[PDB]
Amino acid sequence: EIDPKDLTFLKELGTGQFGVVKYGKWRGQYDVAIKMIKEGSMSEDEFIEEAKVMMNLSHEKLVQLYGVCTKQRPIFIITEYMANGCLLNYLREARHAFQTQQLLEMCKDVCEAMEYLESKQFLHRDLAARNCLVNDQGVVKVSDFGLSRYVLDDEYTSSVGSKFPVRWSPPEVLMYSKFSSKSDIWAFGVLMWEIYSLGKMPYERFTNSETAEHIAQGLRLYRPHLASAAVYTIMYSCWHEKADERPTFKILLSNILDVMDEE
Ligand SMILES: CN1CCN(C(=O)c2ccc(Nc3nc(-c4cccc(NC(=O)c5ccc(C(C)(C)C)cc5)c4)cn4ccnc34)cc2)CC1
The missing domain is CATH 3.30.200.20 (Phosphorylase Kinase; domain 1)
Structure with a gap:
């Protein structure tokens, strides 16, 4: 207090x-x-x-x-x-002219935070670039984890509402309200796609309804130009149709560090 x-x-x-x-x-x-x-x-x-x-x-x-x-x-x-504000707006400013090592470092910053939350069995439930912030040194931190549970706005909390984070949600959340460690993993893969796309909207040519239908059929976001095959494999691993086949944050962190060393 x-x-x-x-x-x-x-x-x-x-x-x-x-x-x-x-x-x-x-x-x-x-x-x-x-x-x-x-x-x-x-x-x-x-x-x-x-x-x-x-x-x-x-x-x-x-x-x-x-x-x-x-x-x-x-x-x-x-x-x-966090002096530099929202990660999504930061990614969209062309003046930063990011190197891809800087983009992977942003993904590692988030993965570290999420590995910590996972170790505490604490779900974010709205992980996305709009809910990460950037400090004066360019470090990305995850914000507003867990607060979705206290929102009184049915447009946000209902799966069919206009503010629900449809494009960051796995099929089992949209179809059955099945929230788990693995729904945050799915959202993390979409966040890495936002980062490597310099802040494009995921499924940029589809509506929310059309996205839900695209993913239910097994199709996924395309590789952003700036992502190597290795980086794409990490984000794509977050989108397995079977939740239990998706990695943990500890595994994703190991994968990201391996790509940093390789590339
Ligand atoms: C390009 N330049 C850099 C940034 N800039 C800014 O004006 C600017 C600079 C710093 C900012 N920092 C912060 N901004 C905010 C902030 C500002 C506006 C709205 C919000 N959003 C919220 O409070 C909010 C977000 C999500 C949620 C749910 C429950 C849905 C997940 C609930 C609440 C946060 C929170 N912070 C916590 C620590 N630092 C900040 C915000 C904006 C302009 C100049």
């Missing part, structure tokens, strides 16, 4: 599923992002209880939760600040 006397609000960063997010300072010293949770957007009591568990998730490649303010409304969520 952070005392709100220790927070100063300095700039507005944007608006997300729970409303406004601000940049500010904690204890007059530390840069932070602060979500101001909009009334009616969140299942607040359930979140408040989970926040205690989320304070225990700490890894160099996960956005660090510093604390919450819950003795007031709106609730605040205070995290480490």
Whole structure:
């Protein structure tokens, strides 16, 4: 529990599923992002209880939760600040003129965070480039893991809703609501495709409905030009029709390090 006397609000960063997010300072010293949770957007009591568990998730490649303010409304969520913003927008800026080693490093940053979450049996459920952030040194960190469980917007939480992450979901999520470690693995493969495509929308010429149908028939995203055959094999391994045949994050991390050494 952070005392709100220790927070100063300095700039507005944007608006997300729970409303406004601000940049500010904690204890007059530390840069932070602060979500101001909009009334009616969140299942607040359930979140408040989970926040205690989320304070225990700490890894160099996960956005660090510093604390919450819950003795007031709106609730605040205070995290480490990520100065370069959303990974998706970062990938789409042509000025960065990324080398493919830098793209693989972004995939490794995410895989490390996810290997840690997997070790804690903690699902993200909305892993995608739009939910990763980039710091001032270009390191990518995974953001907002687990928060999907507290969203009160049926367009987001329903498989048939307009905001559901259809293009990052395996067939067993879309057809049966079967969520598992292996649905985050599928989404990770789509995120590597976003990275190597410099932020293209997955299945860029299809609708959400058409994507669900394409994948149910065994077809998959094509290799992005910048991906070698080895990089493509890693992302494609995440999309096996049988969930239990998809790798773990520990295996994907080993595969990525092997490609780094080879290429
Ligand atoms: C190109 N330049 C670099 C970036 N830039 C920016 O304006 C800019 C710079 C830093 C930014 N940083 C952060 N931005 C945010 C942020 C801002 C707006 C919206 C959101 N999104 C959310 O709060 C949000 C996202 C997903 C979810 C669910 C539950 C659906 C998974 C719930 C909530 C986050 C969070 N952060 C946590 C730590 N750092 C940041 C955001 C924007 C412009 C200049």
